[PDB]
Design a protein around this ligand. Structure first.
Ligand code: FMN
Ligand code: FMN
Ligand code: FMN
Ligand code: FMN
Ligand code: CA
Ligand code: CA
Ligand code: CA
Ligand code: CA
Ligand code: CA
Ligand code: CA
Ligand code: CA
Ligand code: CA
Ligand code: CA
Ligand code: CA
Ligand code: CA
Ligand code: CA
Ligand code: CA
Ligand code: CA
Ligand code: CA
Ligand code: NA
Ligand code: TB
Ligand code: TB
Ligand code: TB
Ligand code: TB
Lengths: 403, 409, 403, 409
């Protein structure tokens, strides 16, 4: 396939893949994504950093051949860098190794095991295990590798950090850089990526950033080139966002999620929202029947409170909540340093109990559950006024919470 | 709307609603359903048994008018029977009460409170509370009301038209089917019995001990033989009531097939490969397999197949120390259904792929035990299975299938 | 239901409905919408302008009650204004007329017929037919009705135009005004609304705007309060956007749409995109298997070219294209004054013919069809280079077209 | 992957793939399917008949190895048969040729060009072009290749194992079903025949005149009686070949039921009300109705029901002078299927609601005529139907149903 490479610096090209048509990846919704791969042309050696998903290499090979032609160089890769084992970035490694079998493959020790388990044809390939802070000279360009299957690669002379999934966003535009798309789209996508993939590592993000700041390594980063989405020409913008998300900096905002069979829990959810809105607090409303866990958690990330509602069905809450609860148990939002507030609610026709389960699970997920409200069938006008008042009292507590 | 009634016995008509276009109801998938309502014409009085979902009464009113015209009777309803409070059978009650405000409403004591909570305009309506058992005479036809026959729902009743032995069972013995044909014998048996199995699996499973208790009582009392037809609130009318009663007895006592239901989810395909390998092992022993992929399959079809399966396998990869979250929906649903209430603890295996510390399979095993399954083993592997690891899945599936065949029915 | 009204001016409130959970309306996808209704308090009479979808009045009644309480007025509506017959804005009229049966209903002559056909209980209601430029005095506030079944209502003293669907956007936020949400979200939603609902009326928008500019009506508009979405505190921003869309002002951009059974048409679509991108022209890629007609036409609206691809199935193009083609026949993009460029493409296994149908239908929809390309089964490397070259030549022509 | 082969006759095995988790294929909905591949062991040579979709060969290789082991034979393929080029049956050919590069590949002349276009690594493979009625001897078993039997696809052929009368028919007589059971008689007849009807409706309808021509040729010549089993490329194997042959004859000649298929779309619900009212009229005459809502129903199920319906109703509201656009997808699909090729011009009515000038119903009538239907009438109304307008829909449906019952197929 003929496909053009994009120059990102002198002798450095993006040779990635535009996955235009994918709509979901591991339960994360998106309007396409990219698998970013990079080609560094030293005076003596050409290095390929990461690659692409199995079966999607046609674009990558076209861009590699285009870059080599633009550089007046033969079609040859001398060094292969594999920053991560996951197949969205290593899926073409068996093809690359077959075409260039003498090119050493630089990766971590655990990555050698993971890559051969994925791709048995790589058994006996020339792996060069990196045990951190190792560097190689390409001829006027230095690549420093920093580590368990993942690592970052720094092109030292220009300060380009090949950060793999860190600082990535699932976006698929013809534009390659952060500044070429609307800021709201970029930052919303970055927020979704942090919420779904970085939240449980929040304490690690804080610990690592202080080390990097105190050592003086932050100032050596001029560009961040991740494995998905846009390339950051303003690295402090994404670093700042990660710091805010890792420390629990939230808006005066509440995320409400519910499911319903006959509509009563929906009426309650809307009534809680009216109470919250009466205090000038923002609301995001999600209906589990047709909304996505990945968008929900994006909004929980900068919300100070989270309401979850569902009716009772055979003594349990409506089962769609179990998917979100399992996902929240994995994400561990309390790792951000904040225990967001919460309320559990729902309608019932007999013994009830679903709201009691929701309250217990919200506490297990790290939320500070303030109250529960379960009612019988269709809410009366007075019961909807109770939902409003509860939402109003919650919204006052939200505004009093610092940062 | 002009719509014809269907005669089901002398002076008894179906006047229900064909909900042609609904595809899902409380998370239960279906290709339309019906809201079955019935008109019983006595010599002196007419009774309407149940009605329909809010906003769907146009067909019902057309059929009621047609039935009156076929009977040579005035357009009048004397008695309103509510066998349940849920809006799929009581949604038109405010309209019926407004048209016929002196027609008493027969229902249970709790149903009065539930009906007024749904529909405040019914405050002050002429409710007639049925306590345990009560009969009324329509003139040559007797309706006997039986309060909370499965005990669990105090808002429900069965109504028996005694002289012809027609049991108006409400949701009991119902199936979510929408055909122009009204009777059990007018559609393919597999469609009818598959729909009945799905209805039991999703709605009756946790009440299995009560179904058996109620059946033993009815058989020892001699009431079973008075039932000549079962006219439920959804789907087909049973002209062969022992066929559905027999099926309910089998499902309530845990009579299963030499069959395994496998459910999994996957991000990169490794758990899928494992699931297929377990199936190959099971199939090598002549045991049936149903395979479900949680990415796009439905909880309501899954539990239909668990109901007559002797084993259940659940697989998912690990994502941040937990199993892939789609399993949580099915696990919450199984916790509600309580399959152990059938008297059988179906066998189970938990499996999955991992990239680091793993742990998702140990969570699946704990949850399967909480849902009442007898978890025999767990198998978690690293990334893509090797040929030998797929052979271990096959062997595990083969050993499970031998155990499934040795389990007595 | 307890729900607060929002003051938009002295004695003027938004008393609408937040339809939080709707995801589709007449085949138009959205993340909820609103049904905006307005309450105007004259010194002598109170007027309700529009209302809401059947079964969604709970919020509206709560906000009306709240507004009357904030004003120190009794719960009473003296005048009812119905700017449109469609049920998303007239669905509560039977309830409003039942509560206030002596309140006249102001609407156009055709609207009386359509409202009684929807709601037979309104037979005998006190309708007051409007012909155009009719005014009513509420006591210190004047409402001027403009017939344009639909009409605009102007609150003359403050220059507030109640424009019904004109200038609307399908958005559901707690924030009510244009300036309170990200500009990209507002303008993308406005673009989608124009593309799906105003495109075929483009010649009328330009005729009306010229009439309104030549006269002194435009400067009397200080705020545009539509029936969906945000209220425009900057009315020239949306009027300007409507002018651009009605005159065919496009970007150097191409929208590519395709469907595929085995993946060959997808490969072709991606190869055309690579050619287009080599010339610095933007690409939006849609896959009909799971993408939406309403998003597709949003992007066609500011694209200078449109590529449509599909394989042949029993001598016809893959049937999903028929839905988009029927929709484009209704929208009439040539009414913007521009015949956007187009190419038809696809793969076949025998006699083919699907691309010839696509090319004929694109011409019927008003596109300037430049070429067609149909190939046999999987494209070879040379055939993908042909797609690239065709896309490259199209992109040169796109850049030469005067905006 | 370890996976067992299934013996279907002496030295003949199914070695196919269970695609458990697929839900859609080229716009055709299904609950999984299979890619049926077969191994014929003669005394001296083994032949593989078709294979599977790219990336799904793991099961196939396991079953091939298993069948060899069951026969006490080495793991070797001597002859490769490609009854079609399409990748669901040729996707593993590059792997099979790489493992057994001297095994000739029997296929049609066009098929060589199509296979090399899909798979360039097959350039220089040992293709053996078939011209029809050609046979090969495997040692006590004979395979007879029949070029383009349905005529329309020059890439296809049928293979007959002459001694046992097993016809490997590729997609002809196939069904998209995925069960552990392999034969027609091991599953409910309604599931099998409904799946067969769906397969004919979506894939064979436009070839109906060729089906009749081919069958007439086969019957006068007497080759019909040499067919003891039909082993297609998807779904169940026919141990009762006259059952599927009979069904194909009925579908190819336009034998229909007293049945009407109604399809509609709606924005505000008025067209839905009309559709339901037409159905009530039809049902009053004892004629069957299938109702489809284009918002969430599938073209492949719709055309299944059109195939044995004597009439077809299509409704949609007007949106900017055109019918609601979802109808365009169904119309494009019907233009391809050419139901008039069955020899019957099914009756039709176009209907819809409008808010201004209308015109959508006139477009629907023109398109229905282009698709080969006999359009009897059109009915377009303003906004919400009144009770009298719904009575008109009922009466129109009643008159259509009387005409449906008078039609002799
Ligand atoms: C299938 C099903 C099972 C139910 N099981 C229970 C139950 O175990 N306990 C209970 O209190 N209510 C049960 N209900 C009643 C609902 O909880 C009740 O209708 C509630 O008002 C529904 O709220 P919703 O309108 O938000 O769906 C059940 C309802 C359905 C349809
Ligand atoms: C977002 C994400 C989070 C993950 N978290 C973990 C983890 O916490 N522990 C672990 O062992 N593996 C983890 N993995 C790796 C997967 O479990 C691993 O890739 C596995 O092989 C996937 O199985 P599958 O192919 O069935 O999806 C994670 C993978 C992803 C994409
Ligand atoms: C159900 C079906 C019907 C087909 N009909 C035709 C046809 O009428 N004419 C033709 O030339 N090819 C036909 N083909 C072959 C396809 O056009 C061919 O595979 C094409 O390359 C598919 O493109 P895609 O890979 O983009 O789906 C048909 C294929 C299928 C599966
Ligand atoms: C976006 C849109 C465009 C419309 N365009 C037209 C039109 O061009 N001509 C017309 O007669 N009616 C038009 N209508 C009105 C519908 O045809 C009318 O509301 C009809 O009653 C809808 O029927 P349904 O309820 O079955 O959707 C339009 C409606 C909408 C929402
Ligand atoms: Ca340079
Ligand atoms: Ca897309
Ligand atoms: Ca290890
Ligand atoms: Ca349907
Ligand atoms: Ca009487
Ligand atoms: Ca008892
Ligand atoms: Ca851990
Ligand atoms: Ca254990
Ligand atoms: Ca939503
Ligand atoms: Ca008129
Ligand atoms: Ca499935
Ligand atoms: Ca031999
Ligand atoms: Ca011939
Ligand atoms: Ca017109
Ligand atoms: Ca006509
Ligand atoms: Na009421
Ligand atoms: Tb990644
Ligand atoms: Tb029910
Ligand atoms: Tb509107
Ligand atoms: Tb096929």
């Amino acid at each position: 396939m003929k496909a053009d490479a994009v120059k990102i610096a002198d002798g450095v090209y993006w040779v990635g893949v535009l996955d235009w048509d994918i709509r979901m990846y591991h339960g994360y919704t998106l309007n396409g994504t990219t698998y970013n791969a990079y080609l560094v042309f030293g005076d003596d050696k050409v290095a390929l950093i990461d690659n692409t998903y199995p079966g999607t290499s046609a674009q990558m090979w076209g861009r590699i051949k285009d870059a080599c032609e633009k550089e007046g160089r033969e079609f040859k890769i001398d060094v292969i860098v594999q920053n991560h084992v996951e197949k969205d970035h290593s899926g073409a490694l068996p093809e690359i190794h077959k075409k260039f079998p003498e090119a050493p493959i630089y990766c971590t020790e655990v990555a050698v095991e993971g890559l051969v388990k994925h791709f048995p044809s790589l058994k006996g390939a020339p792996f060069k295990v990196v045990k951190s802070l190792e560097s190689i000279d390409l001829g006027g360009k230095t690549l420093t590798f920093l580590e368990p299957d993942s690592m970052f690669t720094l092109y030292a002379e220009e300060g380009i950090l090949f950060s793999n999934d860190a600082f990535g966003q699932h976006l698929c535009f013809t534009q390659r850089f952060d500044h070429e798309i609307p800021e709201n789209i970029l930052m919303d996508a970055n927020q979704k990526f942090y919420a779904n993939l970085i939240t449980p590592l929040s304490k690690l993000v804080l610990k690592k950033f202080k080390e990097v700041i105190e050592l003086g390594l932050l100032e050596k980063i001029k560009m961040i080139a991740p494995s998905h989405g846009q390339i950051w020409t303003d690295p402090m913008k994404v670093i700042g966002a990660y710091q805010d998300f890792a420390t629990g900096k939230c808006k005066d905002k509440v995320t409400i999620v519910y499911d319903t069979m006959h509509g009563s829990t929906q009426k309650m959810a809307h009534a809680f929202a009216e109470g919250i809105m009466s205090e000038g607090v923002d609301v995001k409303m999600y209906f589990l029947h047709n909304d996505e866990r990945s968008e929900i958690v994006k909004d929980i990330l900068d919300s100070k409170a989270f309401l979850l509602g569902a009716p009772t069905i055979y003594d349990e809450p409506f089962p769609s909540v179990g998917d979100l609860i399992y996902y929240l148990k994995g994400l561990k939002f309390n790792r951000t340093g904040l225990k967001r507030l919460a309320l559990a609610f729902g309608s019932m026709g007999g013994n009830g109990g679903g709201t009691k389960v929701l309250a217990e699970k919200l506490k297990e997920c790290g939320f500070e559950v303030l109250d529960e409200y379960e009612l019988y069938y269709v809410p009366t006008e007075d019961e909807l006024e109770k939902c409003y008042n509860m939402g109003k009292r919650l919204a006052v507590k939200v505004k009093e919470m610092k940062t």
